[PDB]
C-alpha cells in the first residue's frame, strides 16, 4: 500500500500492481507494474535507467 | 570448447534428456557463440541442434511369444 | 615416403590371455603397436571405423583377424614432431575370405 502511494506521489503515475520480495542480500525489491496508460519507457527515461 | 551451457538449455527446449540432444560437431563455433534459450531456438529451427530418435525397444518378440501362446 | 598397404592382423594370437574387461582396449593397443612396427612411424591414428569394427562385438570378443589398411602420409601440420604418420583404417574384405590374402600394396 505504501509502495503504490509513494510511486504515485513521486513520479506522478500509478501502479496497477506491485510485487515485492526481500532479495537475499538484505534489502527489499519491488516490481511496480504501471497501468498501461503510462509507459515504462517514458518513465525510465524521465528518471534515467536505460 | 565447452558446451555444458548448451546441452542444458537444449534438453530443456527440445524437452528431452541431455543424452538426446545432438550438437553437430562441425559447427561448435556457432553453437558456442549461441548464448541464450532464444539462440538455442533459432539454432533448432536452423537445424544445427537435433533431437536424437529414441532407442528402439520393439515388442515384436513379445508379440510373437504371445501369438504362439494363444 | 608415403605409402598405403593392406595388412591382415592376426589378433587372436596378440590378444590371447588378456583380461576380458581389457580385450578390446588391448586390441586397440595392438593395432597401434602393429602399425608402429610395420611402418616405423611412432604416431598411429586409428580411424573411427576401425574402432567401431573392433568394439562392435562387446569388450570380451574381438574379431580374430582384422584386414586393415595403413596409410603412411605426410604430416602437413606446420607445427609437428614427426615428418610423417600412419593412419590405419578398416579395409574392405573380398568375398573369398581371408584365404591366401597376404600383405598387398595399394595403388
Amino acid at each position: 500500500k505504501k509502495i503504490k502511494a509513494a510511486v504515485k506521489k513521486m513520479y506522478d503515475i500509478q501502479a496497477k500492481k506491485v510485487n515485492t520480495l526481500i532479495r537475499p542480500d538484505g534489502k527489499k525489491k519491488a516490481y511496480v507494474k504501471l497501468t498501461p496508460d503510462y509507459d515504462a519507457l517514458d518513465v525510465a527515461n524521465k528518471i534515467g535507467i536505460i | 570448447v565447452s558446451l555444458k551451457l548448451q546441452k542444458r538449455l537444449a534438453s530443456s527446449v527440445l524437452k528431452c534428456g541431455k543424452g538426446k540432444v545432438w550438437l553437430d560437431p562441425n559447427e561448435v563455433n556457432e553453437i558456442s557463440m549461441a548464448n541464450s534459450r532464444q539462440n538455442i531456438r533459432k539454432l533448432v529451427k536452423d537445424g544445427f541442434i537435433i533431437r536424437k530418435p529414441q532407442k528402439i525397444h520393439s515388442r515384436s518378440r513379445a508379440r510373437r511369444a504371445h501369438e504362439a501362446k494363444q | 615416403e608415403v605409402v598405403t598397404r593392406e595388412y591382415t592382423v592376426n589378433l587372436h594370437k596378440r590378444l590371447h590371455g588378456c583380461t576380458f574387461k581389457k580385450k578390446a582396449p588391448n586390441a586397440i593397443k595392438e593395432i597401434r603397436k602393429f602399425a608402429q612396427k610395420a611402418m616405423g612411424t611412432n604416431d598411429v591414428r586409428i580411424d573411427v571405423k576401425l574402432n567401431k569394427h573392433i568394439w562392435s562385438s562387446g569388450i570380451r570378443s574381438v574379431p580374430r583377424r582384422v584386414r586393415v589398411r595403413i596409410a603412411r602420409k605426410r604430416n602437413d601440420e606446420e607445427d609437428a614432431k614427426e615428418e610423417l604418420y600412419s593412419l590405419v583404417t578398416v579395409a574392405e574384405v573380398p568375398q573369398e575370405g581371408l584365404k591366401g590374402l597376404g600383405t598387398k600394396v595399394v595403388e
Partner: protein, 50 residues
C-alpha cells in the same frame, strides 16, 4: 531450508555481507596492520551453527 523464518533470513543477509576479502585499498592506509580477512566463513567448513 526453503521455509525459513524472517529472522533467520535477516541474519543470513548479514552473514552474507560479511564475506568479502578486505578491500584492495585499506591495505595502504597509514600505519596499517590488517593483512587478509581472518573472519572468512565457508559454507562447507564452518557452519554458522544457527
Amino acid at each position: 531450508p526453503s521455509h525459513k523464518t524472517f529472522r533467520i533470513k535477516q541474519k543470513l543477509a548479514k552473514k552474507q555481507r560479511q564475506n568479502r576479502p578486505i578491500p584492495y585499498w585499506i591495505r595502504m592506509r597509514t600505519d596499517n596492520t590488517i593483512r587478509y580477512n581472518a573472519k572468512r566463513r565457508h559454507w562447507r567448513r564452518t557452519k554458522l551453527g544457527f
